[PDB]
Design a protein around this ligand. Structure first.
Ligand SMILES: C#Cc1c(F)ccc2cc(O)cc(-c3ncc4c(N5CCC[C@@](C)(O)C5)nc(OC[C@@]56CCCN5CC(=C(F)F)C6)nc4c3F)c12
Ligand SMILES: Nc1nc2c(ncn2[C@@H]2O[C@H](COP(=O)(O)OP(=O)(O)O)[C@@H](O)[C@H]2O)c(=O)[nH]1
Ligand SMILES: [Mg+2]
Length: 170
């Protein structure tokens, strides 16, 4: 049987969560994917010769807390925490997303990757030092992505899978 990995993509509206997920699954860049659609997508990919079936939750919608949303997020094995390099507020928000993951996982050691998306854009307000300092504080990898050019997309998802394996057997 394939090995299943439950991945969850989190961050502010507009950072590129859907664009990154669609690049991974469909190998194209979507300009305008409905900002309100939250769904789980499946990708079969071989990583270090293991056939993986990724279950990727592309988050969306309102800021709502419930036992049922808590429990859904608790089943996540690994999280991509995405901000956009031209969105200071999305970066500032990362501490909150990590706090919510740590709360439902009741752990400081949750497989996570910090993803700085939209690296193709010229209007950079979050410098790489800010990103690297935050990831080092959390003890997690940082990787710059462009969903537009596809730079870093495979790297972000494969690295998260490897972080999950390092944490737990699969
Ligand atoms: C996301 C998320 C999330 C986790 F990563 C882990 C466990 C969670 C448990 C929960 O019950 C709920 C969530 C969750 N759901 C939605 C969430 C959501 N919305 C609106 C912005 C776009 C969206 C896709 O992130 C959905 N937004 C926020 O925080 C939004 C901010 C901005 C305005 C004030 N909020 C707090 C904040 C800071 F910086 F203090 C960021 N968190 C969510 C959340 F924790 C969990
Ligand atoms: N230039 C550029 N635009 C992007 C990138 N990723 C997403 N976008 C655009 O930013 C907007 C929001 O992306 P979306 O994936 O809908 O964000 P989400 O709200 O986090 O799902 C869309 O117009 C995307 O085309 C990227 O890496 N570079
Ligand atoms: Mg989206």
């Amino acid at each position: 049987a394939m090995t299943e990995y439950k991945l969850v993509v989190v961050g502010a509206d507009g950072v590129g969560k859907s664009a990154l997920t669609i690049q991974l699954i469909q190998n194209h860049f979507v300009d305008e994917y409905d900002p309100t659609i939250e769904d789980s997508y499946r990708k079969q990919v071989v990583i270090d010769g293991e056939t993986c079936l990724l279950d990727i939750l592309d988050t969306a919608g309102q800021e709502e807390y419930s036992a049922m949303r808590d429990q859904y997020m608790r089943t996540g094995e690994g999280f991509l925490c995405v901000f956009a390099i031209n969105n200071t507020k999305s970066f500032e928000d990362i501490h909150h997303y990590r706090e919510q993951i740590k709360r439902v996982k009741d752990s400081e050691d949750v497989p996570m990757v910090l993803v700085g998306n939209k690296c193709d854009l010229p209007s950079r307000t979050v410098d790489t030092k800010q990103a690297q300092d935050l990831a080092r504080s959390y003890g997690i990898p940082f990787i710059e992505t462009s969903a537009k050019t596809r730079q870093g997309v495979d790297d972000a998802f494969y690295t998260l899978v490897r972080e999950i394996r390092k944490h737990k057997e699969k």
